[PDB]
């Protein structure tokens, strides 16, 4: 088989600056005698299915503009992206097509760069209301901040919680390229009602030290 | 033009089987291989496998070869992909793709809009509507709890308030149902005058619930 590995995972380039995604193959893709690179590479943007840009290493498909260019030869490729657009944000997939099974790169997700911003973090208790049912939700949110590398950490009366929280992360936003970060921690309304002080421990690199947002149940 | 049309998305259980589709039109579907490629979750491509139409000559990955069955109904131009039996474990997006032209083999030139595939124990609920309450920027938002299957919208003051907005990917709780946030930045000095109500539509389950947020008493 033919294994493909891309570099970087995930790319940060400033709008209108140069974007670089590298392709390597396990063993030569090189077609001979037709001496051509039997190499894809594929754009994906959320939500949609991936698209052609790039067939034979080097050749442009068409309608594809420009600013996309492919390179490399034999087992080591590389896109590039000559001044990076709005519209490039997305993931990119390589592909070899020199045999079967005809294998896919694991993708390299194209971010925008943007200076770091230290997220602000709230902390909300459950309502009554979802306590009336039997359980209560802790959220903790942090918002707009950059890098998307961020660590939430619960603490219940200076226990630290384990394995009771989810968290998500949203896309880039479309006005700032910042993201935003919302924990839940679960709790049954009997644990919730045992416990006095819920507090968020958020760690990130534009903050000099960890922040802690906490409440006093019942205050 | 070139299409690739597949079967809607599918919520199924464990243990049923599924035959899912995919179409092609403005050329000729014998002349052509199709590929099928899975996405599961926050995941990258995966090659499946590829089928022949014209001879049902069909080629599998490793990975995939006696988990599903790919084949093709050249008289209506369509392709296949089934499983006898759903696993949890199935959960992803499947596209179905065009091989190009080229002699030898070639890259895939068109794609389908893919298949969503669910595959759960969980059955049809809408979400309970809670409150996350306001503690010069002030942040509040709307807990989407206990909802089955995806999607859920939601809206602030009707779509009069986009500014500052995040809803969040959903997660997938232990219980089999989703839950989603979602939150609003604001001024301080508006929590007393602005009525801030966040609008749910939960499709699936035709329930849609408009609650309005406010500081606590």
């Known amino acids: 088989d033919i294994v493909m590995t891309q570099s970087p995972d995930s790319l940060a380039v400033s709008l209108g600056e140069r974007a670089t995604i590298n392709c390597k193959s396990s063993?030569?893709?090189?077609?001979?005698?037709?001496?051509?690179?039997?190499l894809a590479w594929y754009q994906q943007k959320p939500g949609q299915p991936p698209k052609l840009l790039i067939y034979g290493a080097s050749t442009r498909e068409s309608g594809v503009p420009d600013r996309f260019s492919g390179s490399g030869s034999g087992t080591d490729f590389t896109l590039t992206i000559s001044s990076l657009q709005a519209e490039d944000v997305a993931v990119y997939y390589c592909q070899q097509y020199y045999l079967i099974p005809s294998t896919f790169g694991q993708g390299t997700k194209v971010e925008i760069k943007r200076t770091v911003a230290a997220p602000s973090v709230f902390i909300f208790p459950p309502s009554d209301e979802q306590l009336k049912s039997g359980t209560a939700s802790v959220v903790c949110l942090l918002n707009n901040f950059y890098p998307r590398e961020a660590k939430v950490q619960w603490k219940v009366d200076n226990a630290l919680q384990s394995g009771n929280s989810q968290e998500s992360v949203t896309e880039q936003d479309s006005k700032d390229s910042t993201y935003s970060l919302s924990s839940t921690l679960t709790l049954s309304k009997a644990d919730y009602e045992k416990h006095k002080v819920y507090a968020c421990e958020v760690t990130h690199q534009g903050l000099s030290s960890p922040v802690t947002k906490s409440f006093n149940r019942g205050e | 033009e070139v299409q690739l049309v597949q079967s809607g998305a599918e919520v199924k259980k464990p243990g049923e089987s599924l035959k899912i589709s995919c179409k092609g039109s403005?050329?000729?579907?014998?002349?052509?291989?199709i590929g099928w490629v899975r996405q599961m979750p926050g995941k990258g491509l995966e090659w499946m496998g590829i089928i022949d139409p014209s001879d049902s000559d069909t080629r599998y990955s490793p990975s995939f070869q006696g988990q599903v069955t790919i084949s093709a109904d050249k008289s209506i131009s369509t392709a296949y992909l089934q499983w006898s039996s759903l696993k949890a474990s199935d959960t992803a997006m499947y596209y179905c793709?065009?091989?190009?032209?080229?002699?030898?083999?070639?890259?895939?030139?068109?794609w389908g809009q893919g298949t969503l595939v669910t595959v759960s124990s969980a059955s049809t609920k809408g979400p309970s509507v809670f409150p996350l309450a306001p503690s010069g920027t002030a942040a509040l938002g709307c807990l989407v709890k206990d909802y089955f299957p995806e999607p859920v919208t939601v809206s602030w003051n009707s779509g009069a308030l986009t500014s500052g907005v995040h809803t969040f990917p959903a997660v997938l709780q232990s219980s089999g149902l989703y839950s989603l946030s979602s939150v609003v930045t604001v001024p301080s000095s508006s929590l007393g005058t602005q009525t801030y109500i966040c609008n749910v539509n939960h499709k699936p389950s035709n329930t849609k619930v408009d609650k309005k947020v406010e500081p606590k008493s």
């Open positions: 793709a065009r091989v190009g032209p080229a002699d030898v083999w070639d890259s895939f030139d068109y």
């Open positions: 403005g050329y000729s579907f014998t002349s052509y291989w």
């Open positions: 063993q030569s893709v090189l077609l001979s005698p037709w001496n051509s690179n039997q």
